[PDB]
Amino acid sequence: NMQEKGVSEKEILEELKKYRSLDLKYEDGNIFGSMCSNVLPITRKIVDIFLETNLGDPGLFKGTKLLEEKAVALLGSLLNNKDAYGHIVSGGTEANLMALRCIKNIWREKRRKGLSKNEHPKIIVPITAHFSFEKGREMMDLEYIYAPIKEDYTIDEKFVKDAVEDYDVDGIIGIAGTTELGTIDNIEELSKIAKENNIYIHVDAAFGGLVIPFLDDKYKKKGVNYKFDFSLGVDSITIDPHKMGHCPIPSGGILFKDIGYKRYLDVDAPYLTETRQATILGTRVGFGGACTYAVLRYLGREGQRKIVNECMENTLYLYKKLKENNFKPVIEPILNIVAIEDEDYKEVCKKLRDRGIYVSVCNCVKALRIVVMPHIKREHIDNFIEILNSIK
Amino acid sequence: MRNMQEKGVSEKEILEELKKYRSLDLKYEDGNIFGSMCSNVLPITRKIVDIFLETNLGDPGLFKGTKLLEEKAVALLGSLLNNKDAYGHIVSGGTEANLMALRCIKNIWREKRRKGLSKNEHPKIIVPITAHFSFEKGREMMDLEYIYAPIKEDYTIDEKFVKDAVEDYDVDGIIGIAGTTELGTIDNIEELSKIAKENNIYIHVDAAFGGLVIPFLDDKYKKKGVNYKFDFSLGVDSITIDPHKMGHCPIPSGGILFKDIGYKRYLDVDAPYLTETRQATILGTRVGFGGACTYAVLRYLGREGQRKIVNECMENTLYLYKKLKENNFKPVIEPILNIVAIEDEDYKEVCKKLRDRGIYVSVCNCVKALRIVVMPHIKREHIDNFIEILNSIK
Ligand SMILES: Cc1ncc(COP(=O)(O)O)c(C=O)c1O
Numbered sequence: 001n002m003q004e005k006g007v008s009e010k011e012i013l014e015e016l017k018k019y020r021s022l023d024l025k026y027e028d029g030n031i032f033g034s035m036c037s038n039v040l041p042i043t044r045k046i047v048d049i050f051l052e053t054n055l056g057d058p059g060l061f062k063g064t065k066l067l068e069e070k071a072v073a074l075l076g077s078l079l080n081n082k083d084a085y086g087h088i089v090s091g092g093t094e095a096n097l098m099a100l101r102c103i104k105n106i107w108r109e110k111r112r113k114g115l116s117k118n119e120h121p122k123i124i125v126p127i128t129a130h131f132s133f134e135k136g137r138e139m140m141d142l143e144y145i146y147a148p149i150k151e152d153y154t155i156d157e158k159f160v161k162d163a164v165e166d167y168d169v170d171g172i173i174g175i176a177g178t179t180e181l182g183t184i185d186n187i188e189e190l191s192k193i194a195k196e197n198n199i200y201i202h203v204d205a206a207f208g209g210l211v212i213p214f215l216d217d218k219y220k221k222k223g224v225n226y227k228f229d230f231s232l233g234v235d236s237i238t239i240d241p242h243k244m245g246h247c248p249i250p251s252g253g254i255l256f257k258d259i260g261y262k263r264y265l266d267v268d269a270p271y272l273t274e275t276r277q278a279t280i281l282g283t284r285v286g287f288g289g290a291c292t293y294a295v296l297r298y299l300g301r302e303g304q305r306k307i308v309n310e311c312m313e314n315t316l317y318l319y320k321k322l323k324e325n326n327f328k329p330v331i332e333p334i335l336n337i338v339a340i341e342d343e344d345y346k347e348v349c350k351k352l353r354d355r356g357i358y359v360s361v362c363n364c365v366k367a368l369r370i371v372v373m374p375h376i377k378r379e380h381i382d383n384f385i386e387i388l389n390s391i392k
Numbered sequence: 393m394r395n396m397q398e399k400g401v402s403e404k405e406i407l408e409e410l411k412k413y414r415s416l417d418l419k420y421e422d423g424n425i426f427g428s429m430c431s432n433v434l435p436i437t438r439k440i441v442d443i444f445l446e447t448n449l450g451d452p453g454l455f456k457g458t459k460l461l462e463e464k465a466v467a468l469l470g471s472l473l474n475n476k477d478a479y480g481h482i483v484s485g486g487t488e489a490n491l492m493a494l495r496c497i498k499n500i501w502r503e504k505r506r507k508g509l510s511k512n513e514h515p516k517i518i519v520p521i522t523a524h525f526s527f528e529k530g531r532e533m534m535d536l537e538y539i540y541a542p543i544k545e546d547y548t549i550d551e552k553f554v555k556d557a558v559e560d561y562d563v564d565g566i567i568g569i570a571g572t573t574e575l576g577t578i579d580n581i582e583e584l585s586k587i588a589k590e591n592n593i594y595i596h597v598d599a600a601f602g603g604l605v606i607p608f609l610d611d612k613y614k615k616k617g618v619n620y621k622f623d624f625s626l627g628v629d630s631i632t633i634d635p636h637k638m639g640h641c642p643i644p645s646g647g648i649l650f651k652d653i654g655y656k657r658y659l660d661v662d663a664p665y666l667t668e669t670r671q672a673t674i675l676g677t678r679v680g681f682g683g684a685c686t687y688a689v690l691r692y693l694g695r696e697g698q699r700k701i702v703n704e705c706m707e708n709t710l711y712l713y714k715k716l717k718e719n720n721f722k723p724v725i726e727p728i729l730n731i732v733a734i735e736d737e738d739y740k741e742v743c744k745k746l747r748d749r750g751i752y753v754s755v756c757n758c759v760k761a762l763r764i765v766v767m768p769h770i771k772r773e774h775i776d777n778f779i780e781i782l783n784s785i786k
């Protein structure tokens with residue numbers, strides 16, 4: 001209940017610290033199933049400096065707005081597109097929803113011209129797609145043609161080519177670093193199908209966008225597709241600094257091939273400095289853009305390769321330890337994600353929590369899921385294997 | 393720079409560049425910003441942001457204390473809005489809050505539709521023309537059919553039209569506003585909630601701004617005949633209320649409260665890899681500091697402190713109002729909340745001339761007027777200065 005008298009700052013900070021003490025901390029080696037991790041320390045200073053900014057009213061914060069544009073230009077450069085148009089948004093979910101909005105509005109235009117026979121947009125989506133796509137389908141009344149995956153947990157490209165032939169398709173979704181397994185769809189083939197048929201293609205690189213471009217050849221595998229960016233001519237790409245960009249939440253990213261896409265996103269915001277708004281959110285943080293730009297500049301490709309390399313070393317060490325202890329990884333890892341087959345995977349995940357280890361689970365395969373973020377070290381992997389052995 | 397490079401750059405260098413950029417921004421405390429519903433955060437919140445920065449309410453089983461603080465923030469807001477059983481979240485802002493209420497309305501309709509109980513192909517929702525643009529984003533993305541309710545001379549929803557519409561159509565939802573975006577006016581939620589209750593229609597109240605002002609408004613500032621009742625005491629289904637507006641909390645700190653936990657089934661989406669496998673929010677990964685700040689600010693201030701902040705904003709609102717009248721300007725209405733609008737046929741150009749002079753005001757949508765939000769950063773000194781620049785422009 002709301003009381004009449006206020007409590008002192010010291011009293012309330014102490015209570016909040018008591019609650020904080022009940023949370024897990026990334027640095028302690030308990031969190032194995034998260035795509036978030038410890039932020040680069042420089043970002044704490046940046047959050048403080050840009051806390052009182054709002055990119056929903058960018059006319060009042062011209063420097064912070066410039067910084068958002070520069071964070072987006074740096075991501076564009078990274079994704080081989082010097083003319084990318086985008087935003088540093090709340091996360092991969094808003095980013096995906098905005099790509100879905102764009103697909104829907106291109107369709108709506110065709111429909112209102114008598115140039116589409118679809119009553120709802122038909123979009124091809126793999127079953128490995130993140131649940132943000134389910135949120136979009138449910139809200140926006142989108143019609144999904146679910147694409148099956150192959151033995152290697154990548155989208156069946158033959159199925160997509162056949163679907164495009166049999167139906168009037170309004171969009172194709174490809175994933176560059178799946179939530180469950182870190183696999184990469186064959187975006188090169190998907191984009192060929194998309195270009196030849198004039199279909200919008202969105203790439204969900206929320207996770208892999210800040211891993212794949214910095215992945216050393218040593219970790220790349222024969223037969224795996226690593227091409228996923230604007231050099232393939234794709235229309236949009238989701239990419240999240242608050243995942244493998246070590247930036248504070250909220251720092252998501254959405255990039256469109258060019259500024260002409262804005263036309264399918266803008267809504268009127270009459271009382272604001274920018275009367276045209278393309279984001280789903282209105283009032284939104286300015287520190288995400290400042291942090292994304294800062295971190296990419298501070299690290300350079302060199303610093304990010306170093307962090308990805310260490311994550312990959314620890315991923316390979318985890319994989320190696322699993323094989324030695326008679327566990328069955330789902331696949332040899334592509335990115336810094338390993339999944340462990342288990343017929344009783346949901347209960348095993350529960351038993352691991354009780355022992356202080358918090359792993360995730362897969363949805364399309366009966367397996368435990370581990371994301372080897374920078375906070376995971378060999379000592380933690382050793383402790384996890386000894387606890388898992390003890391449980392089995 | 394604009395392109396990636398191989399080598400990193402020092403912390404000193406990048407912080408120096410960032411500060412050059414920050415210096416181009418306006419600052420709330422400088423008396424430049426007159427049209428924002430955001431202001432300076434209470435200093436205590438900077439410490440809370442830092443403590444809770446590395447949390448994520450999208451994976452609450454990893455951050456059990458942070459989740460408990462979200463629940464306590466929602467409970468404190470529920471109590472303030474006369475509901476000790478409220479179910480809700482500290483979300484990204486009033487937009488996501490409003491979008492969640494619209495999803496709830498749509499999912500109740502969908503349930504009816506499949507049960508052969510609705511004749512509507514899309515949900516029909518009564519929306520006043522003073523509704524915030526988040527409502528348009530909703531309409532556009534979710535294929536919602538809006539029955540646009542007109543406003544009366546006092547800029548409040550025409551309750552008769554609403555009752556007339558509810559009679560003529562199969563209505564799925566009604567939207568009322570407690571502190572309109574443009575003028576700070578309050579719809580007659582009592583009448584709307586009576587119409588809603590008697591017809592078993594979902595009613596959502598957008599109190600994004602007014603939710604943290606109205607409950608702390610001293611009688612001295614209330615006007616006879618004006619409706620101030622807007623909360624769960626009226627039996628409404630959901631209320632949007634934003635701490636990052638008049639709660640002095642850092643962005644993102646928005647709020648969505650539902651009458652009870654029974655509303656959650658109309659929002660849940662499966663999140664199979666996460667500690668909590670059902671998410672009701674639109675966002676997935678999301679700040680944990682919003683709830684911590686919301687709860688802490690409400691405890692730190694108490695009703696006493698928030699009442700003092702709100703009342704000084706009203707003192708400054710009445711001062712601005714007097715100064716306008718004394719200088720022959722025409723306020724659109726007598727202020728209800730801490731928002732004053734100035735009638736001007738040439739509002740678009742005068743707004744531009746004001747920012748050329750360093751004053752940044754807003755404009756209205758349904759009336760030709762400049763729009764001023766008297767947030768706590770606006771003091772008499774700034775109001776005085778604004779009147780001189782505006783008289784000088786004329
Ligand atoms: C591939 C992919 N897309 C989208 C998302 C959603 O991102 P966020 O949780 O930041 O909203 C995630 C992670 O949850 C992801 O794995």
Ligand SMILES: Cc1ncc(COP(=O)(O)O)c(C=O)c1O
Binds near residue numbers: 484487571598599
């Ligand atoms: C009445 C009302 N509802 C909703 C919103 C949206 O809030 P936000 O910008 O925090 O998304 C606003 C803010 O402008 C508002 O004034």
